[PDB]
Amino acid sequence: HMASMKKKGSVVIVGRINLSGDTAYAQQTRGEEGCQETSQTGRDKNQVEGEVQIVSTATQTFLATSINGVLWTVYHGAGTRTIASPKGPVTQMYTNVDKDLVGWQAPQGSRSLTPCTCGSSDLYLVTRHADVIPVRRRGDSRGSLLSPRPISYLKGSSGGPLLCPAGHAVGIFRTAVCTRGVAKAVDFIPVESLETTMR
Ligand SMILES: [Zn+2]
């Protein structure tokens, strides 16, 4: 009955993918206990750094990527949930189920990637395990893995970035394209589609 109805939890930043040096690596900033409490209160006092965040819900863990002052991720992971912040749960600034895209204002202390202007088709996918996978762009919204892998390796990487050779943001990883469970290609949200949503 109505008095007993719970509320959806907040997305919680539980770590980041460090790309600021010569070596990419994942860092955890909050354990599962703190994540649970933070998800319920929506209050996160942790300092955020970097461009690529690891985020969790009650059920899922995936990625969120800051581009031009917006932290972007996929609707099929975050739905309409708020994200926890130092002042409380923060409401989504963008919500587009048709693009499978959501976004919040980038957390204070985060760094944003710059949208790519190069038109290059040699791309690099950053995974939740700090893999940097070469990807050849094949369309506005798809690239092919130079070395196909089992889908397991890409699980939980939605919302991660596809990068230009110069480190610009080219797209947000949306979902893998598989055959017999083997990921041979990836579909992503082009950054141009993000810029249009941003006006
Ligand atoms: Zn570029």
CSV table of N, CA, C and O in Angstrom, one decimal, residues 14 20 36 80-82 91 95 99 112 117 123 125 129 131-132 143 147-148 166 173-174 186 188:
chain,number,residue,atom,x,y,z
A,14,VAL,N,31.5,4.9,-7.6
A,14,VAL,CA,32.2,4.0,-6.8
A,14,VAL,C,33.7,3.9,-7.2
A,14,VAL,O,34.5,3.2,-6.5
A,20,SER,N,45.1,9.8,-16.8
A,20,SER,CA,45.9,11.0,-16.8
A,20,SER,C,47.4,10.7,-16.9
A,20,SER,O,48.2,11.7,-17.0
A,36,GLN,N,25.9,1.3,-0.9
A,36,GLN,CA,24.5,1.1,-0.5
A,36,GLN,C,23.9,2.3,0.3
A,36,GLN,O,22.9,2.8,-0.1
A,80,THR,N,16.0,6.6,-15.0
A,80,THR,CA,15.7,8.0,-14.7
A,80,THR,C,16.3,8.4,-13.3
A,80,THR,O,15.9,9.4,-12.8
A,81,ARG,N,17.2,7.6,-12.8
A,81,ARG,CA,17.6,7.8,-11.4
A,81,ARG,C,18.4,9.1,-11.3
A,81,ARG,O,19.0,9.6,-12.2
A,82,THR,N,18.4,9.6,-10.1
A,82,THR,CA,19.3,10.7,-9.7
A,82,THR,C,20.7,10.2,-9.4
A,82,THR,O,20.9,8.9,-9.3
A,91,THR,N,19.1,15.7,-9.9
A,91,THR,CA,18.2,15.2,-11.0
A,91,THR,C,18.9,15.2,-12.3
A,91,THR,O,19.7,16.1,-12.6
A,95,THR,N,17.6,13.4,-20.4
A,95,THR,CA,17.0,12.1,-20.4
A,95,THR,C,16.4,11.8,-21.8
A,95,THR,O,15.5,12.5,-22.2
A,99,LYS,N,17.8,7.8,-27.6
A,99,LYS,CA,19.2,7.6,-27.8
A,99,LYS,C,19.9,6.7,-26.7
A,99,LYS,O,21.1,6.5,-26.8
A,112,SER,N,36.3,17.2,-17.9
A,112,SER,CA,35.5,16.9,-19.1
A,112,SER,C,36.4,16.6,-20.3
A,112,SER,O,37.4,17.4,-20.4
A,117,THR,N,36.7,16.9,-33.0
A,117,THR,CA,36.5,17.6,-34.3
A,117,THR,C,37.3,17.1,-35.4
A,117,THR,O,37.3,17.7,-36.5
A,123,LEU,N,39.6,4.6,-33.4
A,123,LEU,CA,39.1,4.9,-32.1
A,123,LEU,C,39.6,3.9,-31.1
A,123,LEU,O,40.2,2.9,-31.4
A,125,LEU,N,38.3,2.3,-27.2
A,125,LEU,CA,37.2,2.1,-26.2
A,125,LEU,C,37.9,1.8,-24.9
A,125,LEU,O,38.8,1.0,-24.8
A,129,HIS,N,37.5,-2.2,-16.8
A,129,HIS,CA,38.7,-2.8,-16.3
A,129,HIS,C,39.9,-2.1,-16.8
A,129,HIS,O,41.0,-2.7,-16.8
A,131,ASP,N,40.8,-1.5,-19.8
A,131,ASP,CA,41.2,-1.8,-21.2
A,131,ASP,C,41.1,-0.6,-22.1
A,131,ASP,O,40.2,0.1,-22.0
A,132,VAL,N,42.0,-0.5,-23.0
A,132,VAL,CA,41.9,0.5,-24.1
A,132,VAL,C,41.9,-0.3,-25.4
A,132,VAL,O,43.0,-0.6,-26.0
A,143,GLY,N,31.3,0.7,-34.4
A,143,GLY,CA,32.7,0.4,-34.7
A,143,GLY,C,33.0,-1.0,-34.5
A,143,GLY,O,32.3,-1.7,-33.7
A,147,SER,N,40.3,-6.8,-32.4
A,147,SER,CA,40.4,-8.1,-31.9
A,147,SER,C,39.1,-8.5,-31.1
A,147,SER,O,38.9,-8.1,-29.9
A,148,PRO,N,38.2,-9.3,-31.7
A,148,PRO,CA,37.0,-9.6,-31.0
A,148,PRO,C,37.2,-10.4,-29.7
A,148,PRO,O,38.2,-11.1,-29.6
A,166,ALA,N,43.7,11.7,-30.6
A,166,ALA,CA,44.2,12.8,-29.7
A,166,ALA,C,43.5,12.8,-28.4
A,166,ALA,O,43.7,13.8,-27.6
A,173,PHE,N,29.9,4.5,-25.3
A,173,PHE,CA,29.7,3.1,-25.5
A,173,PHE,C,28.3,2.7,-25.0
A,173,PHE,O,27.9,3.0,-23.9
A,174,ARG,N,27.4,2.2,-25.9
A,174,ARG,CA,26.0,1.9,-25.6
A,174,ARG,C,25.8,0.4,-25.4
A,174,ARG,O,25.4,-0.1,-24.3
A,186,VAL,N,30.9,-2.8,-31.8
A,186,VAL,CA,30.2,-2.0,-30.7
A,186,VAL,C,29.4,-0.9,-31.3
A,186,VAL,O,29.7,-0.4,-32.4
A,188,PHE,N,27.6,2.8,-30.3
A,188,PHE,CA,27.9,3.9,-29.3
A,188,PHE,C,27.0,5.1,-29.7
A,188,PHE,O,26.6,5.2,-30.9
